[PDB]
Design an enzyme around this catalytic site. Sequence first.
Site, short mmCIF file in Angstrom:
data_model
loop_
_atom_site.label_atom_id
_atom_site.label_comp_id
_atom_site.label_asym_id
_atom_site.label_seq_id
_atom_site.Cartn_x
_atom_site.Cartn_y
_atom_site.Cartn_z
N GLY A 49 8.43 3.11 2.53
CA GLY A 49 9.39 4.10 3.02
C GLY A 49 10.77 3.62 2.63
N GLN B 125 7.26 -0.50 5.57
CA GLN B 125 6.24 -0.59 4.52
C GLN B 125 4.90 -1.01 5.14
OE1 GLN B 125 8.13 -4.97 3.25
NE2 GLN B 125 7.16 -3.73 1.65
N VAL B 126 3.80 -0.71 4.44
CA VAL B 126 2.45 -1.16 4.80
C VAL B 126 1.94 -2.03 3.65
CG1 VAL B 126 0.05 -0.58 5.38
CG2 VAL B 126 1.94 0.76 6.34
N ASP C 165 -0.18 6.89 12.32
CA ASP C 165 1.19 7.40 12.19
C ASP C 165 1.92 6.41 11.29
OD1 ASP C 165 3.66 8.71 12.49
OD2 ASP C 165 3.81 8.44 14.65
N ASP D 246 3.21 14.24 14.93
CA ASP D 246 3.18 14.40 13.46
C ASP D 246 1.72 14.43 12.96
OD1 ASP D 246 4.11 14.69 10.78
OD2 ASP D 246 4.84 12.62 10.61
N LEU E 270 0.85 -1.20 0.00
CA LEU E 270 0.00 0.00 0.00
C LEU E 270 0.88 1.25 0.00
CD1 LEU E 270 -2.65 -1.28 2.59
CD2 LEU E 270 -3.16 -0.69 0.21
N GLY E 271 1.99 1.19 0.74
CA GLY E 271 2.96 2.27 0.85
C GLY E 271 4.32 1.77 1.29
N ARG F 17 -2.33 13.88 6.06
CA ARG F 17 -1.67 12.68 5.51
C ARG F 17 -1.65 11.50 6.54
NH1 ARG F 17 2.16 16.49 6.45
NH2 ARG F 17 3.50 16.01 8.24
N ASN F 18 -1.83 11.81 7.84
CA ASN F 18 -1.86 10.84 8.94
C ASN F 18 -3.28 10.65 9.52
OD1 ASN F 18 0.85 9.78 9.02
ND2 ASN F 18 1.56 11.56 10.18
C1 LIG Z 1 -6.39 1.99 1.02
O1 LIG Z 1 -5.07 2.45 1.31
C2 LIG Z 1 -4.59 2.27 2.58
C3 LIG Z 1 -5.32 1.76 3.63
C4 LIG Z 1 -4.73 1.62 4.91
N1 LIG Z 1 -5.50 1.10 5.92
C5 LIG Z 1 -4.88 1.00 7.10
N2 LIG Z 1 -3.61 1.33 7.41
C6 LIG Z 1 -2.87 1.84 6.43
O2 LIG Z 1 -1.56 2.20 6.66
C7 LIG Z 1 -1.10 2.22 7.98
C8 LIG Z 1 -0.83 3.44 8.60
C9 LIG Z 1 -0.38 3.45 9.90
C10 LIG Z 1 -0.20 2.26 10.60
N3 LIG Z 1 0.24 2.23 11.95
C11 LIG Z 1 -0.18 3.13 12.87
O3 LIG Z 1 -0.95 4.06 12.61
C12 LIG Z 1 0.37 2.94 14.28
N4 LIG Z 1 -0.26 3.93 15.14
C13 LIG Z 1 -1.56 4.05 15.49
C14 LIG Z 1 -1.60 5.15 16.29
C15 LIG Z 1 -2.80 5.76 16.99
C16 LIG Z 1 -2.84 7.26 16.82
C17 LIG Z 1 -2.82 5.40 18.45
N5 LIG Z 1 -0.34 5.65 16.40
N6 LIG Z 1 0.48 4.90 15.69
C18 LIG Z 1 -0.47 1.05 9.97
C19 LIG Z 1 -0.93 1.03 8.66
C20 LIG Z 1 -3.38 2.01 5.10
C21 LIG Z 1 -2.65 2.54 4.00
C22 LIG Z 1 -3.24 2.68 2.77
O4 LIG Z 1 -2.63 3.17 1.65
C23 LIG Z 1 -1.32 3.73 1.80
#
Ligand SMILES: COc1cc2ncnc(Oc3ccc(NC(=O)Cn4cc(C(C)C)nn4)cc3)c2cc1OC
Length: 305
Positions: A31, A35-36, A184, A166, A28-29, A170-171
Amino acid sequence: LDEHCERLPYDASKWEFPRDRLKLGKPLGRGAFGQVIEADAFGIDKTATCRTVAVKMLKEGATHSEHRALMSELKILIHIGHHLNVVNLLGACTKPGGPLMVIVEFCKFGNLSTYLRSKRNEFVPYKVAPEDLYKDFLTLEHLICYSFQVAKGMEFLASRKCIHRDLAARNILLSEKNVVKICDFGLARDIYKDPDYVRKGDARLPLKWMAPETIFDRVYTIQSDVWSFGVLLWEIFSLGASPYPGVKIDEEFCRRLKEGTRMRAPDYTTPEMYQTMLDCWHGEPSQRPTFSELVEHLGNLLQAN
Ligand SMILES: COc1cc2ncnc(Oc3ccc(NC(=O)Cn4cc(C(C)C)nn4)cc3)c2cc1OC
Protein backbone atom coordinates in the site's frame (compact mmCIF):
# COMPACT_ATOMS: atom_id res chain seq x y z
CA LEU A 1 -17.13 -2.84 20.20
CA ASP A 2 -14.65 -2.13 17.32
CA GLU A 3 -15.18 1.69 17.64
CA HIS A 4 -13.25 1.89 20.98
CA CYS A 5 -10.32 -0.55 20.37
CA GLU A 6 -7.78 1.42 22.49
CA ARG A 7 -9.22 0.11 25.83
CA LEU A 8 -8.89 -3.58 24.80
CA PRO A 9 -6.07 -5.75 26.28
CA TYR A 10 -2.76 -6.89 24.72
CA ASP A 11 -1.54 -9.96 26.67
CA ALA A 12 2.19 -10.23 25.69
CA SER A 13 2.69 -13.44 27.75
CA LYS A 14 0.35 -15.21 25.25
CA TRP A 15 0.79 -13.45 21.86
CA GLU A 16 4.35 -12.05 21.78
CA PHE A 17 6.61 -13.85 19.25
CA PRO A 18 10.43 -13.28 19.25
CA ARG A 19 11.67 -11.38 16.13
CA ASP A 20 14.65 -13.83 15.83
CA ARG A 21 12.18 -16.72 15.19
CA LEU A 22 10.63 -15.02 12.12
CA LYS A 23 12.47 -15.22 8.71
CA LEU A 24 11.05 -12.54 6.34
CA GLY A 25 10.56 -13.42 2.67
CA LYS A 26 9.15 -11.66 -0.41
CA PRO A 27 6.41 -8.96 -0.30
CA LEU A 28 2.92 -10.20 -1.25
CA GLY A 29 1.23 -6.76 -1.43
CA ARG A 30 2.05 -3.09 -0.82
CA GLY A 31 0.00 0.00 0.00
CA ALA A 32 1.20 3.57 0.53
CA PHE A 33 1.80 3.00 4.27
CA GLY A 34 1.36 -0.73 4.93
CA GLN A 35 2.48 -4.05 3.40
CA VAL A 36 2.00 -7.85 3.65
CA ILE A 37 5.17 -10.04 3.53
CA GLU A 38 5.49 -13.86 3.27
CA ALA A 39 7.60 -15.35 6.11
CA ASP A 40 8.77 -18.58 7.78
CA ALA A 41 7.94 -18.75 11.51
CA PHE A 42 9.75 -21.25 13.74
CA GLY A 43 7.38 -22.87 16.28
CA ILE A 44 4.58 -20.26 16.22
CA ASP A 45 1.77 -22.95 16.61
CA LYS A 46 3.45 -26.41 16.93
CA THR A 47 6.71 -26.93 18.90
CA ALA A 48 9.90 -26.63 16.75
CA THR A 49 7.91 -26.68 13.47
CA CYS A 50 8.56 -24.34 10.49
CA ARG A 51 5.35 -22.71 9.17
CA THR A 52 4.73 -20.32 6.24
CA VAL A 53 2.82 -17.24 7.55
CA ALA A 54 1.75 -13.78 6.27
CA VAL A 55 2.91 -10.66 8.18
CA LYS A 56 1.18 -7.23 8.11
CA MET A 57 3.55 -4.34 8.95
CA LEU A 58 4.25 -0.70 8.00
CA LYS A 59 6.62 0.74 5.33
CA GLU A 60 8.29 4.00 4.18
CA GLY A 61 5.66 6.79 4.39
CA ALA A 62 3.87 5.58 7.55
CA THR A 63 3.87 7.82 10.68
CA HIS A 64 3.10 7.35 14.43
CA SER A 65 -0.66 7.60 13.45
CA GLU A 66 -0.44 4.37 11.35
CA HIS A 67 1.62 2.67 14.16
CA ARG A 68 -1.30 3.45 16.61
CA ALA A 69 -3.86 2.14 14.03
CA LEU A 70 -2.00 -1.21 13.55
CA MET A 71 -1.85 -1.71 17.40
CA SER A 72 -5.65 -1.13 17.57
CA GLU A 73 -6.11 -3.77 14.77
CA LEU A 74 -4.05 -6.28 16.83
CA LYS A 75 -6.24 -5.64 19.93
CA ILE A 76 -9.56 -6.12 17.98
CA LEU A 77 -8.28 -9.38 16.36
CA ILE A 78 -7.55 -10.81 19.87
CA HIS A 79 -11.14 -9.84 21.01
CA ILE A 80 -12.70 -11.41 17.87
CA GLY A 81 -10.90 -14.74 18.30
CA HIS A 82 -10.71 -17.64 15.86
CA HIS A 83 -13.03 -19.29 13.29
CA LEU A 84 -12.37 -21.45 10.18
CA ASN A 85 -13.77 -18.74 7.87
CA VAL A 86 -11.63 -15.79 9.05
CA VAL A 87 -7.86 -15.13 8.47
CA ASN A 88 -6.66 -15.97 12.02
CA LEU A 89 -4.11 -14.21 14.27
CA LEU A 90 -1.05 -16.38 15.18
CA GLY A 91 1.14 -13.87 17.08
CA ALA A 92 2.77 -10.42 17.07
CA CYS A 93 6.15 -8.64 17.43
CA THR A 94 5.55 -5.44 19.55
CA LYS A 95 8.77 -5.03 21.62
CA PRO A 96 10.86 -1.82 21.23
CA GLY A 97 13.78 -1.84 18.75
CA GLY A 98 11.85 -3.13 15.73
CA PRO A 99 8.64 -2.63 13.71
CA LEU A 100 5.15 -3.67 14.89
CA MET A 101 4.30 -6.98 13.06
CA VAL A 102 0.88 -8.75 13.06
CA ILE A 103 1.33 -12.44 12.08
CA VAL A 104 -1.59 -14.36 10.45
CA GLU A 105 -2.36 -17.68 8.66
CA PHE A 106 -0.98 -17.96 5.08
CA CYS A 107 -3.69 -18.53 2.33
CA LYS A 108 -1.78 -19.95 -0.66
CA PHE A 109 -4.29 -19.13 -3.50
CA GLY A 110 -4.66 -15.41 -2.60
CA ASN A 111 -7.75 -13.22 -3.19
CA LEU A 112 -11.03 -14.76 -4.46
CA SER A 113 -11.71 -12.13 -7.19
CA THR A 114 -8.42 -12.84 -9.06
CA TYR A 115 -8.75 -16.61 -8.44
CA LEU A 116 -12.26 -16.90 -9.94
CA ARG A 117 -11.31 -14.67 -12.94
CA SER A 118 -8.21 -16.89 -13.60
CA LYS A 119 -10.38 -20.09 -13.55
CA ARG A 120 -13.39 -18.65 -15.50
CA ASN A 121 -12.51 -20.68 -18.65
CA GLU A 122 -12.47 -24.04 -16.73
CA PHE A 123 -15.98 -23.66 -15.13
CA VAL A 124 -18.72 -26.30 -15.72
CA PRO A 125 -22.16 -25.99 -13.92
CA TYR A 126 -22.28 -29.75 -13.14
CA LYS A 127 -19.46 -32.32 -13.51
CA VAL A 128 -20.76 -35.12 -15.84
CA ALA A 129 -19.08 -38.61 -15.80
CA PRO A 130 -16.73 -40.15 -17.10
CA GLU A 131 -14.23 -37.62 -18.64
CA ASP A 132 -14.71 -34.93 -15.89
CA LEU A 133 -14.25 -37.38 -12.90
CA TYR A 134 -10.46 -36.73 -12.45
CA LYS A 135 -10.43 -33.06 -13.62
CA ASP A 136 -10.29 -30.23 -11.01
CA PHE A 137 -12.79 -27.74 -12.53
CA LEU A 138 -14.91 -25.14 -10.68
CA THR A 139 -18.64 -26.05 -10.41
CA LEU A 140 -21.93 -24.48 -9.14
CA GLU A 141 -21.37 -26.55 -5.91
CA HIS A 142 -17.95 -24.81 -5.35
CA LEU A 143 -19.53 -21.31 -5.83
CA ILE A 144 -22.47 -22.00 -3.43
CA CYS A 145 -19.97 -23.53 -0.93
CA TYR A 146 -17.77 -20.33 -1.02
CA SER A 147 -20.97 -18.23 -0.53
CA PHE A 148 -22.02 -20.39 2.49
CA GLN A 149 -18.51 -20.16 4.09
CA VAL A 150 -18.43 -16.32 3.82
CA ALA A 151 -21.93 -16.14 5.43
CA LYS A 152 -20.61 -18.39 8.31
CA GLY A 153 -17.57 -16.10 8.86
CA MET A 154 -19.81 -12.98 8.87
CA GLU A 155 -22.33 -14.60 11.29
CA PHE A 156 -19.27 -15.27 13.57
CA LEU A 157 -17.99 -11.63 13.23
CA ALA A 158 -21.51 -10.30 14.12
CA SER A 159 -21.56 -12.57 17.24
CA ARG A 160 -18.38 -10.75 18.45
CA LYS A 161 -20.21 -7.35 18.14
CA CYS A 162 -17.97 -6.27 15.20
CA ILE A 163 -18.74 -5.09 11.64
CA HIS A 164 -16.52 -5.37 8.53
CA ARG A 165 -17.13 -2.07 6.55
CA ASP A 166 -15.22 -3.25 3.38
CA LEU A 167 -16.70 -6.67 2.47
CA ALA A 168 -15.85 -7.64 -1.18
CA ALA A 169 -14.22 -10.55 -3.13
CA ARG A 170 -10.82 -8.72 -2.98
CA ASN A 171 -11.06 -9.16 0.89
CA ILE A 172 -11.74 -12.96 0.77
CA LEU A 173 -8.69 -15.32 0.63
CA LEU A 174 -8.61 -18.93 -0.59
CA SER A 175 -6.59 -21.54 1.34
CA GLU A 176 -6.18 -25.35 0.92
CA LYS A 177 -9.13 -27.83 0.74
CA ASN A 178 -11.52 -25.19 -0.76
CA VAL A 179 -11.57 -23.17 2.54
CA VAL A 180 -12.31 -19.38 2.13
CA LYS A 181 -11.45 -16.78 4.82
CA ILE A 182 -12.60 -13.18 5.40
CA CYS A 183 -9.75 -10.62 5.75
CA ASP A 184 -9.16 -6.82 5.64
CA PHE A 185 -6.00 -5.64 3.83
CA GLY A 186 -6.56 -2.08 5.13
CA LEU A 187 -3.30 -0.05 4.90
CA ALA A 188 -1.63 -2.90 2.93
CA ARG A 189 -3.79 -2.00 -0.12
CA ASP A 190 -3.04 1.26 -2.03
CA ILE A 191 -6.62 2.68 -2.13
CA TYR A 192 -5.43 5.85 -3.94
CA LYS A 193 -4.20 3.68 -6.89
CA ASP A 194 -7.07 1.07 -6.83
CA PRO A 195 -10.06 1.59 -9.22
CA ASP A 196 -12.47 -0.09 -6.71
CA TYR A 197 -12.11 3.02 -4.45
CA VAL A 198 -13.63 6.35 -5.66
CA ARG A 199 -13.02 9.92 -4.37
CA LYS A 200 -16.03 11.06 -2.26
CA GLY A 201 -15.39 14.34 -0.43
CA ASP A 202 -11.82 13.76 0.81
CA ALA A 203 -11.65 9.95 1.42
CA ARG A 204 -11.44 7.13 -1.20
CA LEU A 205 -14.45 4.80 -0.67
CA PRO A 206 -15.61 1.43 -2.17
CA LEU A 207 -18.77 2.97 -3.71
CA LYS A 208 -19.82 -0.10 -5.80
CA TRP A 209 -20.07 -2.23 -2.56
CA MET A 210 -21.82 0.38 -0.34
CA ALA A 211 -25.48 0.34 0.81
CA PRO A 212 -27.51 3.56 0.05
CA GLU A 213 -27.60 4.51 3.80
CA THR A 214 -23.76 4.28 3.85
CA ILE A 215 -23.36 6.44 0.68
CA PHE A 216 -25.98 9.08 1.66
CA ASP A 217 -25.99 8.99 5.49
CA ARG A 218 -22.49 7.59 6.41
CA VAL A 219 -24.31 4.80 8.38
CA TYR A 220 -22.35 1.52 8.94
CA THR A 221 -24.15 -1.49 10.55
CA ILE A 222 -24.22 -5.31 10.21
CA GLN A 223 -27.16 -4.80 7.75
CA SER A 224 -24.98 -2.53 5.49
CA ASP A 225 -22.50 -5.50 5.50
CA VAL A 226 -25.44 -7.71 4.24
CA TRP A 227 -25.80 -5.30 1.22
CA SER A 228 -22.00 -5.71 0.54
CA PHE A 229 -22.45 -9.54 0.83
CA GLY A 230 -25.06 -9.24 -1.99
CA VAL A 231 -22.43 -7.48 -4.18
CA LEU A 232 -19.89 -10.24 -3.16
CA LEU A 233 -22.43 -12.94 -4.36
CA TRP A 234 -22.66 -11.12 -7.75
CA GLU A 235 -18.80 -11.17 -7.96
CA ILE A 236 -18.78 -14.97 -7.24
CA PHE A 237 -21.52 -15.86 -9.80
CA SER A 238 -19.93 -13.57 -12.50
CA LEU A 239 -16.65 -15.51 -11.92
CA GLY A 240 -14.64 -12.43 -10.82
CA ALA A 241 -16.14 -9.62 -12.95
CA SER A 242 -16.28 -5.96 -11.79
CA PRO A 243 -19.78 -4.80 -10.50
CA TYR A 244 -22.15 -2.46 -12.48
CA PRO A 245 -20.54 -3.15 -15.93
CA GLY A 246 -20.26 -0.03 -18.13
CA VAL A 247 -21.84 2.27 -15.47
CA LYS A 248 -20.07 5.59 -14.60
CA ILE A 249 -19.83 5.74 -10.76
CA ASP A 250 -20.98 9.36 -10.22
CA GLU A 251 -23.78 11.46 -8.54
CA GLU A 252 -26.35 9.97 -11.05
CA PHE A 253 -25.40 6.34 -10.14
CA CYS A 254 -25.99 7.02 -6.38
CA ARG A 255 -29.46 8.60 -7.07
CA ARG A 256 -30.60 5.65 -9.29
CA LEU A 257 -29.42 3.21 -6.56
CA LYS A 258 -31.32 5.17 -3.83
CA GLU A 259 -34.51 5.00 -6.03
CA GLY A 260 -34.33 1.17 -6.37
CA THR A 261 -32.24 0.53 -9.55
CA ARG A 262 -30.26 -2.76 -9.32
CA MET A 263 -27.67 -4.90 -11.17
CA ARG A 264 -28.87 -7.46 -13.74
CA ALA A 265 -28.18 -11.22 -13.14
CA PRO A 266 -24.53 -12.36 -13.71
CA ASP A 267 -23.69 -15.01 -16.39
CA TYR A 268 -23.20 -18.05 -14.05
CA THR A 269 -26.04 -17.60 -11.48
CA THR A 270 -29.01 -19.89 -10.68
CA PRO A 271 -32.49 -18.22 -10.27
CA GLU A 272 -32.44 -18.76 -6.44
CA MET A 273 -28.95 -17.20 -6.08
CA TYR A 274 -30.08 -14.06 -8.02
CA GLN A 275 -33.19 -13.74 -5.77
CA THR A 276 -30.79 -13.96 -2.73
CA MET A 277 -28.74 -11.01 -4.21
CA LEU A 278 -31.97 -8.94 -4.65
CA ASP A 279 -33.03 -9.73 -1.02
CA CYS A 280 -29.59 -8.48 0.31
CA TRP A 281 -30.24 -5.29 -1.73
CA HIS A 282 -33.59 -4.34 -0.10
CA GLY A 283 -33.76 -0.53 0.28
CA GLU A 284 -34.78 -0.92 3.97
CA PRO A 285 -31.86 -2.34 6.10
CA SER A 286 -34.18 -4.15 8.61
CA GLN A 287 -35.88 -5.96 5.67
CA ARG A 288 -32.63 -7.50 4.34
CA PRO A 289 -31.95 -11.05 5.69
CA THR A 290 -29.56 -11.47 8.66
CA PHE A 291 -26.29 -13.46 8.36
CA SER A 292 -27.87 -16.26 10.52
CA GLU A 293 -30.81 -16.47 8.04
CA LEU A 294 -28.34 -16.49 5.05
CA VAL A 295 -26.34 -19.37 6.70
CA GLU A 296 -29.58 -21.48 6.92
CA HIS A 297 -30.67 -20.64 3.32
CA LEU A 298 -27.26 -21.25 1.69
CA GLY A 299 -26.72 -24.45 3.72
CA ASN A 300 -30.05 -25.77 2.37
CA LEU A 301 -29.16 -24.70 -1.27
CA LEU A 302 -25.68 -26.34 -1.02
CA GLN A 303 -27.24 -29.65 0.08
CA ALA A 304 -29.95 -29.30 -2.66
CA ASN A 305 -27.23 -28.75 -5.35
C1 LIG B 1 -0.64 -15.92 -1.85
O1 LIG B 1 -0.89 -14.52 -1.73
C2 LIG B 1 -1.28 -14.04 -0.51
C3 LIG B 1 -1.54 -14.81 0.59
C4 LIG B 1 -1.93 -14.21 1.81
N1 LIG B 1 -2.18 -15.03 2.89
C5 LIG B 1 -2.55 -14.40 4.00
N2 LIG B 1 -2.72 -13.07 4.19
C6 LIG B 1 -2.48 -12.28 3.15
O2 LIG B 1 -2.62 -10.92 3.27
C7 LIG B 1 -3.20 -10.40 4.43
C8 LIG B 1 -4.47 -9.84 4.38
C9 LIG B 1 -5.05 -9.34 5.53
C10 LIG B 1 -4.36 -9.39 6.74
N3 LIG B 1 -4.92 -8.91 7.95
C11 LIG B 1 -6.23 -9.07 8.27
O3 LIG B 1 -7.04 -9.63 7.52
C12 LIG B 1 -6.66 -8.52 9.62
N4 LIG B 1 -8.06 -8.87 9.81
C13 LIG B 1 -8.62 -10.09 9.96
C14 LIG B 1 -9.95 -9.85 10.10
C15 LIG B 1 -11.07 -10.85 10.30
C16 LIG B 1 -12.25 -10.56 9.40
C17 LIG B 1 -11.51 -10.88 11.74
N5 LIG B 1 -10.15 -8.50 10.03
N6 LIG B 1 -8.99 -7.91 9.85
C18 LIG B 1 -3.09 -9.96 6.78
C19 LIG B 1 -2.51 -10.47 5.63
C20 LIG B 1 -2.07 -12.80 1.88
C21 LIG B 1 -1.80 -12.02 0.72
C22 LIG B 1 -1.42 -12.62 -0.45
O4 LIG B 1 -1.14 -11.97 -1.61
C23 LIG B 1 -1.39 -10.56 -1.67
